[PDB]
Amino acid sequence: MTDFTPETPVLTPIRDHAAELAKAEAGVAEMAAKRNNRWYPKYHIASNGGWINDPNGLCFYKGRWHVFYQLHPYGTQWGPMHWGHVSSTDMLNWKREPIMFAPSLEQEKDGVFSGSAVIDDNGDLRFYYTGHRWANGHDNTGGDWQVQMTALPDNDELTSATKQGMIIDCPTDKVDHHYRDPKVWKTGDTWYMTFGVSSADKRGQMWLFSSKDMVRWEYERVLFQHPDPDVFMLECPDFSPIKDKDGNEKWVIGFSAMGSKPSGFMNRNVSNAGYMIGTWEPGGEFKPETEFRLWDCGHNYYAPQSFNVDGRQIVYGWMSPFVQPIPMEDDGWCGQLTLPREITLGDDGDVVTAPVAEMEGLREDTLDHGSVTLDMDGEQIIADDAEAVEIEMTIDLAASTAERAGLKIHATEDGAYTYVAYDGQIGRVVVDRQAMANGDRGYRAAPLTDAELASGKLDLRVFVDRGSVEVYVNGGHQVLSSYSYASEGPRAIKLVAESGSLKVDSLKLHHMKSIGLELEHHHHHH
Amino acid sequence: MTDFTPETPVLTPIRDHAAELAKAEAGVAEMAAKRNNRWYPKYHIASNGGWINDPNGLCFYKGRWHVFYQLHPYGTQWGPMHWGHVSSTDMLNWKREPIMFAPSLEQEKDGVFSGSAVIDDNGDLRFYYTGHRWANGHDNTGGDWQVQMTALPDNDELTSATKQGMIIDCPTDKVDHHYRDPKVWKTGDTWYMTFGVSSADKRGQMWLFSSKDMVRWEYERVLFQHPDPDVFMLECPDFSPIKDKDGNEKWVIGFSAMGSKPSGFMNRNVSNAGYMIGTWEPGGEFKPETEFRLWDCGHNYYAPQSFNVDGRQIVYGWMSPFVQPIPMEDDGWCGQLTLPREITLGDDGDVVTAPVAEMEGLREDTLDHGSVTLDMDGEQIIADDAEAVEIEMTIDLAASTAERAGLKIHATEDGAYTYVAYDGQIGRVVVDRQAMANGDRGYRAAPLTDAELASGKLDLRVFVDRGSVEVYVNGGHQVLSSYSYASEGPRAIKLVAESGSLKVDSLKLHHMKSIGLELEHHH
Ligand SMILES: OC[C@H]1O[C@](O)(CO)[C@@H](O)[C@@H]1O
Ligand SMILES: OC[C@H]1O[C@](O)(CO)[C@@H](O)[C@@H]1O
Ligand SMILES: [Cl-]
Ligand SMILES: [Cl-]
Ligand SMILES: [Cl-]
Ligand SMILES: [Cl-]
Ligand SMILES: [Cl-]
């Protein structure tokens, strides 16, 4: 099968797409109607009903931000994959759009898997996505059978699109089933695509294809092979140039890696997404210059996708719940995205992912505490019932003798809480759920460099939403995103010093606005 | 004769000792009469009223175990130092004895500091201790002024002693104030003494002296100087020979070091006690063969003293509360000692400090839970209300996928607890107080060797008392001792697995008897 790259797309409809979309819409609205809002986000993207996963089709196009996502419109576990869709002009007030894709073509009949959206040379958007089949025709026992597909929007609003079919087949001979998650970009006079592959020797790979017209593709080479032989697959690959403030471009390769074994604080989650920084000449293989580093050090983060708009590289992740129990799945929804983060390189040359500047517009108010000191082990109340807030704080590392200090959030009447803390014995920032009464527990610890540790200050920017926390360390040099399933009743926030003093130079709380996606007319505040 | 080793003791009485003892008894009794027992130990040694610190005068003599301890008889913070005293015929049932020493001689007039007991060549006990003066005559603001003293018991019960005065003076110009905490022992045909000193260059040292008759001493040399320049003093030195796995003698040097900077999980407390293993040619310098290691990795442990009984080296530590707040101080007492431990060398050549075997006699019963498994993140109640209990468990590390797992103790209705856990991300046993409602919090983490991590099994022996936890890891290869000031109500114990499975191959609980020092109690 030497030509697994057809000259014209192979289009093979087996179901009526509009009728499948219509079924999907009915499924989501029914879950939304009955949905329990206890842990539902006020300012993160989730489906109005049902399970989501990877963010997809991310773009700014025709004056709107668009976020699509893998969606199961019939329940709160993963199932037949669809694309859901939300859009906004400002990244602050979002509108639920129609479901975008439902399985309707032969090569995607078991699911419309992850993909991306790029603006072409004529300013028109094109979608690329993976079509999924079971290899044995029925379920996962026989592994996956995956190909690359393309589609075009029907209108500037992207409220619908027309499928064109398969553009890249799978040489099953040459791979171990896994063959998915495309990203297309242009460098120079040529378009490139990469997607993740498990080779025949079960090594996680990224393959490179090229094109001059976006629909006809040619295999170039293996762009990257994961150096760890336990790593069998690279899901949701990313590959983008990021500029320093010095005028240089570095290539950042990203992937959601399956198969790594956990080691110390690294790679603790079932699968783990991360990046390497290095160089790339077009057609060639990636040359890494750093070891693998996580995008996000928390409990619940996977499958990040990034996109470029006007020199900005923005990334969303899926807050992935891989570990039982998953309390929210009984509530008519499951899963949310992170806030949008901007990718930059910092002064040390490492990747930094601060929240995008637009996130400041979430703040309804500022309660400025000024500087706060705890002279010894103790706690101060910051909120008695904080549902959706951002806390910004700067710790004077130089003056605080505390061994561990930070915030207890979702601190309820039963004594449960999630702890966000600087830990001076390991020299890290932790999110520790040991005291939580719902969800799996454990802790996650984000590294601080020697310079960050000898610095006089540590900045934390902590977003608490009804079901989650995101901790941005030193302006997003590290981030931890974790679910936190608050118990019932008022949810306090406490500032905490353990075993020594804590000097905080600045502490501010901001209440967060709703992003307009939680709205549901069967829910009467009343 | 300013030379610092008098030919005969310098005896200088300035106060009526009996009257000073009577005043101290009245002070302790006032605190005892109002004591709140909420955190008061059921099976550890504390004063009946007041603050204690270092264990002192430790011995077995004329058919009894004796424990003395630094005592402030007038308050529940540190203050003018006396020695308190308990005794026992079995280590299980203890009695309060008369306060032993109050300051009554010029050279100890601001405190009878730490010291030790040894049995001489004729089978007679002698005491050695430090006499403390404020260097400026008032307060700690001008530093310490310290010398070594001796005394003999007046009877086989050790209920009182005759003081003999000062036997080792301080050469002011060779020392930076600190000069204290004697230990005496015999090697070959010679008696030796060591104590801690801060040199003129502010280095922590143990000096060595020798004697023929245990009363007149001769300076020999500096036995040991701590290799870290930040360490300026070595309090409560210890030095004793221990038989290794091959039947060979090793010398273990111990001290309570002042001035180390915390580094990672090491040396976290205000001051830190520990040991090195090495060799000694009698009369020579100690030669370490190991780096410094802590006796105990927990929050509250300091000033351990050891003594020898029928070939066994037994050690007690003070559970030191150096960090505010100290909520027990409102309750008419402050400070308890650890259980007694035996110092041995393990198969890997490192020190092991298991509870002495007599501690098995604390057990009133055995509740055998057998094998327990948690299949995923979860909790199981092991005891609904545990005031004073010992839990023995073996965890199968090979089978358990949990990231962290263990026992929450003192688990009360307000959701507070102290967590004793294996932590798979750091490969350590931790005691974590973050959720406690009373006292300072934080965590402490005891190391496991690669061989211990590779074995596939982890043994914990956890002693819960009303205000404390002691965790004995792998037979006492490591120990963590910490105060745990439980909240009000029933105090549960829960087995906990986080983010994966926990296989416990064996779990046993034993209720602990009272050692009788609390007298009548309310359960
Ligand atoms: O929903 C299926 C999608 O989820 C992923 O496995 C990553 O979480 C992608 O590889 C795939 O396209
Ligand atoms: O109470 C005084 C005693 O306590 C110590 O400082 C150790 O805790 C000793 O060096 C001293 O003899
Ligand atoms: Cl790491
Ligand atoms: Cl509030
Ligand atoms: Cl709120
Ligand atoms: Cl250590
Ligand atoms: Cl009990």
- Tokens describing residue A265: 């604080």
Going from the C-alpha of A340 to that of each of A43, A215, A304, A357, B75, the distances in angstroms are 11, 30, 10, 9, 59
Q: How far apart are CA B209 and CA A27, in angstroms?
A: 88
Residue A386 CB partners (closer than 8 Å, separation 6+): A409, A464, A491, A492, A493, A509
Q: How far apart are CA B119 and CA A141, in angstroms?
A: 77
- Tokens describing residue B263: 């580094």
By CB neighbour count within 10 A (0-12 exposed, 13-18 middle, 19+ buried), where does B139 fall?
exposed
Ligand 6 centroid to Cα of residue B446, in Å, is 7
Ligand 3 centroid to Cα of residue A365, in Å, is 36
CA angle B128, B132, B134 (to 5 degrees): 170
Intervals of CATH 2.60.120.560 along chain B: 365-513
Nearest CA-CA partner of B52 in B473, B334, B379 = B334
Chain A residues 480-499 with CB within 8 Å of chain B: 498-499
E strand intervals along A259-388: 272-279, 287-288, 293-294, 302-309, 312-319, 333-334, 336-337, 341-345, 351-355, 367-374, 378-383
Residue given tokens 């020697």 in the structure block: A450
Residues A302, A273: contact at Cβ < 8 Å?
A: yes
Q: How far apart are CA A314 and CA A311, in angstroms?
A: 10
Strand, coil or helix: what is B231? coil
Residues A364, A76: contact at Cβ < 8 Å?
A: no
- Residue B316 is inside which H or E element, if any? strand B312-319
Q: DSSP H helical segments within A164-289, as ranges?
A: none
* B450 DSSP assignment: H
* A171 DSSP assignment: -
Instruction: Tell me the shortest Cα–Cα distance from A92 to chain B, in angstroms.
Output: 34
Residue B111 CB partners (closer than 8 Å, separation 6+): B80, B81, B103, B131, B132
Going from the C-alpha of B172 to that of each of B3, B167, B177, B217, B222, the distances in angstroms are 11, 16, 7, 18, 16
A180 DSSP β-pair partners: A196
* B490 DSSP assignment: -
- The region, left, alpha or beta by phi > 0 then psi within -120 to 50, assigned to residue A295 is alpha
Annotated active-site residue in B54, B144, B296, B432 = B54
- Helices H / strands E in chain B, number of each: 2, 35
* B247 DSSP assignment: S
User: Catalytic annotation on B54?
Assistant: yes
Closest-lying ligand 1 atom to the alpha carbon of residue A196: 10
Using the Cα atoms of residue A93, residue A98, residue A99 and residue A100 in order, give the sign of their dihedral.
negative
Q: Is A44 a pocket residue for ligand 1 (Cβ < 6 Å)?
A: no
- Tokens describing residue A248: 């240089």
3-state secondary structure B146-214: EEEEEEEECCCCCCCEEEEEEEECCCHHHEEEEEEEEEEEEECCEEEEEEEEEECCCCEEEEEEEECCC
Let me know if domain B365-513 sits in CATH 2.60.120.560: yes
Q: What are phi and psi of B46, to 5 degrees?
A: -130, 165
Task: Quickly list DSSP for A124-143.
Answer: -EEEEEEEEEETTSSSGGG-
Distance of CA B165 to the CA centre of its chain: 27
Chain breaks after residues in chain B, where C lies over 2.5 Å from next N: none
Q: How far apart are CA B72 and CA B53, in angstroms?
A: 9
Nearest CA-CA partner of A459 in A472, A471, A474 = A474
Would strands B50-61 and B333-334 be described as parallel, antiparallel, or unpaired?
parallel
Strand, coil or helix: what is B399? coil
Residue A88 CB partners (closer than 8 Å, separation 6+): A64, A65, A94, A95, A515
B459 annotated to a ligand binding site: no
Closest-lying ligand 1 atom to the alpha carbon of residue A256: 7
Chain B residues 380-409 with CB within 8 Å of chain A: 403-404
Residues B462, B382: contact at Cβ < 8 Å?
A: no
By CB neighbour count within 10 A (0-12 exposed, 13-18 middle, 19+ buried), where does B153 fall?
buried
Nearest CA-CA partner of B266 in B422, B447, B404 = B447
Q: How far apart are CA B297 and CA B274, in angstroms?
A: 10
Residues A95, A87: contact at Cβ < 8 Å?
A: yes
B441 touches chain A (CB under 8 A): yes
B54 annotated to a ligand binding site: yes
Q: How far apart are CA B521 and CA B37, in angstroms?
A: 8
User: What residues are neighbours of ligand 4 (ion), with CB under 5 Å?
Assistant: A 383-385
A150 DSSP β-pair partners: A128, A165
Residues B10, B2: contact at Cβ < 8 Å?
A: no
- Test B323 with A500 for CB contact under 8 angstroms: yes
Residues A58, A314: contact at Cβ < 8 Å?
A: yes
Strand, coil or helix: what is A305? strand
E strand intervals along A259-299: 272-279, 287-288, 293-294
Task: Please list every residue in chain B whose beta carbon sits closer than 8 Å to the beta carbon of residue A425.
Answer: 262, 264-265, 268, 443, 445
A10 touches chain B (CB under 8 A): no
**Which superfamily does A1-364+514-526 belong to?**
Glycosyl hydrolase domain; family 43 (2.115.10.20)
- Test A499 with B442 for CB contact under 8 angstroms: yes
Strand, coil or helix: what is A172? helix
CA angle A436, A439, A441 (to 5 degrees): 60
By CB neighbour count within 10 A (0-12 exposed, 13-18 middle, 19+ buried), where does A522 fall?
exposed
Nearest CA-CA partner of A130 in A144, A145, A146, A117 = A146
Ligand 7 centroid to Cα of residue A98, in Å, is 62
Q: How far apart are CA B44 and CA A264, in angstroms?
A: 37
- Tokens describing residue A419: 């702890």
Intervals of CATH 2.115.10.20 along chain A: 1-364+514-526
Residues A384, A490: contact at Cβ < 8 Å?
A: yes
Nearest CA-CA partner of B273 in B218, B331, B318 = B318
Q: Which CATH number fits domain B1-364+514-523: 3.40.47.10, 3.10.20.600, 2.60.40.10, 2.115.10.20?
A: 2.115.10.20
Q: How far apart are CA B257 and CA B205, in angstroms?
A: 10
- Tokens describing residue A232: 């069998």
Active site residues of A: 54
Chain breaks after residues in chain A, where C lies over 2.5 Å from next N: none
Closest-lying ligand 1 atom to the alpha carbon of residue A178: 10
A265 touches chain B (CB under 8 A): yes
A441 touches chain B (CB under 8 A): yes
Resolution in A: 1.8
Nearest CA-CA partner of B292 in B222, B204, B218 = B204
Residues B342, B356: contact at Cβ < 8 Å?
A: yes
- Residue B234 is inside which H or E element, if any? strand B233-243
Q: What are phi and psi of B520, to 5 degrees?
A: -65, 135
Q: How far apart are CA B454 and CA A310, in angstroms?
A: 53
Task: Quickly list DSSP for A6-73.
Answer: -SS-B--B-S-HHHHHHHHHHHHHHHHHH---TT--SSS---SSEEEEEEEEEEEETTEEEEEEEEET
Q: DSSP H helical segments within B266-403, as ranges?
A: none
A463 DSSP β-pair partners: A390, A470
- Tokens describing residue B143: 């530093």
Nearest CA-CA partner of A93 in A387, A525, A519 = A519
